[PDB]
Symmetry: C3
Subunit: 105 residues, 3 copies
Amino acid sequence: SNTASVVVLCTAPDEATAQDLAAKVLAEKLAACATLIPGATSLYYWEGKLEQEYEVQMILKTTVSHQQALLECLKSHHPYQTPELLVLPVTHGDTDYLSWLNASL
Amino acid sequence: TASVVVLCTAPDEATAQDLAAKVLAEKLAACATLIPGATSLYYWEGKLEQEYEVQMILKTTVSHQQALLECLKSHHPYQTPELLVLPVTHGDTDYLSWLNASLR
Amino acid sequence: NTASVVVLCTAPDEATAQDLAAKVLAEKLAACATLIPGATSLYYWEGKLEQEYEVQMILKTTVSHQQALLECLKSHHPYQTPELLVLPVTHGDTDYLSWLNASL
């Protein structure tokens, strides 16, 4: 059987950072795959001020058994103090793809 | 305190940015990420439509999700825009703390 | 009114993504498909870091159709084993969800 999987959402200030973060967690085998979507814009209040920054949206694939380690790793290498680090559950997926995801870890 | 992620689409960046600033000011979401350059396909009144759109991803909590949806829906140019809620099973403690603190 | 879900699938290019979306829509296995080109997928293969420019697909459907959608998507997909993951929708705008269920 395959271990339950998840997708992790994280945002980086730019493409270089996003790729460095992705390369690192992939090497550490904490994620099986990482999708980087550049050209994004994030709006949020930071200490009372409305900010609007350019960001690269990251979507990382891994399993529940690695999510904790993945977030800890991402947070350490991330330039931001409190980066976006959210985990969404994958309730279902193609069996063979999930096997590859599991095998990659 | 359970966090959730909300999916919404807008016709252009101006409208998307307007929607975000609005819900952020009302403290119904802590953050909104906009992704332009997208395309949506769906049937409408019998024909397959293909529209250029901006994908929105907002972060909030279960306690605020309903109010967030109503507000977005109200200011959205469309009558029935995409408004979907996905559950967050885990997240960095500090980020989640910041998210909750940013809400109403 | 069946529970809805969102399906993530990655396509190698814009043409493939639109063809896949049109196909599943015609088959009534999804209600809507959002395509985000310009995405980069990173993963190890044969021992070396692969970097592919792809299209991120986000499809809307219900749990009663998730399995059929995945099978249709995989079959028409040019890759042998494309990314095919299902995320649950725990909530959403009532009218939107009704339209979603009705489109199926």
